Design a protein around this nucleic acid. Structure first.
Ligand SMILES: Nc1ncnc2c1ncn2C1O[C@H](COP(=O)(O)O)[C@@H](O)[C@H]1O
Ligand SMILES: N[C@@H](CCC(=O)O)C(=O)O
Length: 529
RNA sequence: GGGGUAUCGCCAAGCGGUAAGGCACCGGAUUCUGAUUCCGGCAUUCCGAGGUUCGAAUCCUCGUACCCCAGCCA
């Protein structure tokens, strides 16, 4: 439960409503991000729990900032997350004729007029946070004039900025949004839905409440920055001929540590080419998280865990990681892959190799097992061999044994280095029948894999609060390795995650993996203390 | 000026009857993944100072801190 669901219950009980109808209204000016998934869960979740309806509406009132590529991806991510909208997808543009009719009601009623104050003058007449505003000299034209002037506007008779429709409210209101807010502005820009049928477009504050009322929304849910705006939302509806009056309730938006969550900033990383695109695995977008290997279920759990309140907050990365680790720990089938390989030869081994049985999930026999090839010329990760070191070190030492995962026990005895002193091969012996612990891969039956280790995008916890956020990017957000995986991974698919034993959870694709060279993304590492 | 929020390191229950839970953290037990799982621990105190009450984080008073608003953006 949360404050919003408690309000809903009170409405139901009293009889103010007998149904709940919510809506998710993103503007198509960018891709969706984890913050939007908080909004999706809230809105679609309430609808389902309360046996109601939730619409998907694209708030497309500003042609110059939107693209059809965005509407398609948004519908795509909403669906991927696991939610369904009520009826057709809606668009604010579907109401363009209605909005125009209503503005005419305001004019006829004396509550709107056509102003000719330039874009610079309007600000200068507006007042300040502590100084009231002043009336435009065009504020008192007659209904007849405004009607004619608005039509000139509609008919493309005015150049951009040359005129606008403003509401006639109170220029000395402590609420600045009520200081004669603009209703319509001129823009000769083709709209992704209406083409070039309109040259005048409605402002957000005029559009949103009217779209909500026509759709029959009962509870209009938005974030905290629209609190002041609720006053204008209520003014418009109270002043036109419409039968319902939806009520707005605001909650705090999500902030994630070590990342930016603003379309303008995310768009900048994309535009300046500092990430592959909106769906880059280091991006906080729904598509990037999907491509990273996150499960829609884990994102829904995250939103569930974080709550909905009016308190400004900033979630730590640990919280998100915990969610994906829970899902994958339970469902991901295990395998073997070596990110940083060094050759180890069991001079003691005779033959071209053999086959060993390995569980698909160590703690769940039900998931089955598989047969993996073993031999005397394998690959192990460098960090797993130490010629010396402490008592705590539980891995392979130059005078000690270890258990090879699901196989035999080996004992290091000799080693071999090169020019720069770097090692090239570790010679060991194995106990003919013995079956710390370390993972390995047989060099003969090994699949050449590209491994992409991802990390936090920015060097700082709050990159959005930096002068130049791009300068505080982490140069190690992506580090590409070349390793070896057990042959079974040959049949892996983009969309399935695996746990590379003793490393983390990885998944295919990355927009790159060919049949020849597979590319694997590290979704998240294992808990290491 | 106006609109909002202040409870554990990060989130968050609590709505006058005497501080839930999650992530994180510290111990110990299992474990052919130093993972998992598993027991135990972790606010005598709720931005501060007064007040009312048998009794308040929960009500009143006065402070303090932080967030949002001066786009013909949403
Ligand atoms: N960080 C965030 N946290 C919660 N909701 C958000 C966040 N960012 C955007 N939204 C929302 O997304 C919806 C509209 O998207 P937009 O127009 O693109 O801001 C709003 O109703 C909000 O719920
Ligand atoms: N378009 C608004 C919708 C929020 C609302 O007014 O409910 C937004 O970006 O948040």
């Amino acid at each position: 439960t949360n404050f919003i669901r408690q309000i809903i219950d009170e409405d139901l009980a009293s009889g103010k409503h007998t149904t709940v109808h919510t809506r998710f209204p993103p503007e198509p000016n960018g891709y969706l991000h984890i913050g939007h998934a908080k909004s999706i869960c809230l809105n679609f979740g309430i609808a389902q729990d309360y046996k109601g309806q939730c619409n998907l509406r694209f708030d497309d009132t500003n042609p110059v900032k939107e693209d059809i590529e965005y509407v398609e991806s948004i519908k795509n991510d909403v669906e991927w997350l696991g939610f369904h909208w009520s009826g057709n997808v809606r668009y604010s543009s579907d109401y363009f004729d209605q909005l125009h009719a209503y503005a005419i009601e305001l004019i006829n009623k004396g509550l709107a007029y056509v102003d000719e104050l330039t874009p610079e003058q309007i600000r200068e007449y507006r007042g300040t946070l502590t100084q009231p505003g002043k009336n435009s000299p065009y504020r008192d034209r007659s209904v007849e004039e405004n009607l004619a002037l608005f039509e000139k506007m509609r008919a493309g008779g005015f150049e951009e900025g040359k005129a606008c429709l403003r509401a006639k409210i109170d220029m000395a209101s402590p609420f600045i949004v009520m200081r004669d807010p603009v209703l319509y502005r001129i823009k000769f820009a083709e709209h992704h839905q209406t083409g070039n049928k309109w040259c005048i477009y409605p402002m957000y504050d005029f559009t949103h409440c009217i779209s909500d009322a026509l759709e029959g929304i009962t509870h209009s849910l938005c974030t905290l920055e629209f609190q002041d705006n609720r006053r204008l939302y209520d003014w418009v509806l109270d002043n036109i001929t419409i039968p319902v009056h939806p009520r707005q309730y605001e909650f705090s938006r999500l902030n994630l540590e070590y990342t930016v969550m603003s379309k303008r900033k995310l768009n900048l990383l994309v535009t300046d080419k500092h990430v592959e695109g909106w769906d880059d695995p280091r991006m906080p977008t729904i598509s990037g998280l999907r491509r990273r290997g996150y499960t829609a279920a884990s994102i829904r759990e995250f939103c569930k865990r974080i709550g909905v309140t009016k308190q400004d907050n900033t979630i730590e990365m640990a919280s998100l990681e915990s969610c994906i680790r829970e899902d994958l720990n339970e469902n991901a089938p295990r395998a073997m892959a070596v990110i940083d390989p060094v050759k180890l030869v069991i001079e003691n081994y005779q033959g071209e190799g053999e086959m060993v049985t390995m569980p698909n999930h160590p703690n769940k026999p039900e998931m089955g097992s598989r047969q993996v090839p073993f031999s005397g010329e394998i690959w192990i990760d460098r960090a797993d061999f130490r010629e010396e070191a402490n008592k705590q070190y539980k891995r392979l030492v130059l005078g000690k044994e270890v258990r090879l995962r699901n196989a035999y026990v080996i004992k290091a005895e000799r080693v071999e280095k090169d020019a720069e002193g770097n090692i090239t091969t570790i010679f060991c012996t194995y106990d003919a029948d013995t079956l710390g612990v370390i993972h390995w891969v047989s060099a003969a039956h090994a699949l050449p894999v590209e491994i992409r280790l991802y990390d936090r995008l920015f060097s700082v916890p709050n990159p959005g609060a930096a002068d130049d956020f791009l300068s505080v990017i982490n140069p190690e957000s992506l580090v590409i390795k070349q390793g070896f995986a057990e042959p079974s991974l040959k049949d892996a698919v983009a969309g399935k995650a695996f746990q590379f034993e003793r490393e983390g959870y990885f998944c295919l694709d990355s927009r790159h993996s060919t049949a020849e060279k597979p590319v694997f993304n590290r979704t998240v590492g294992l808990r290491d203390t």
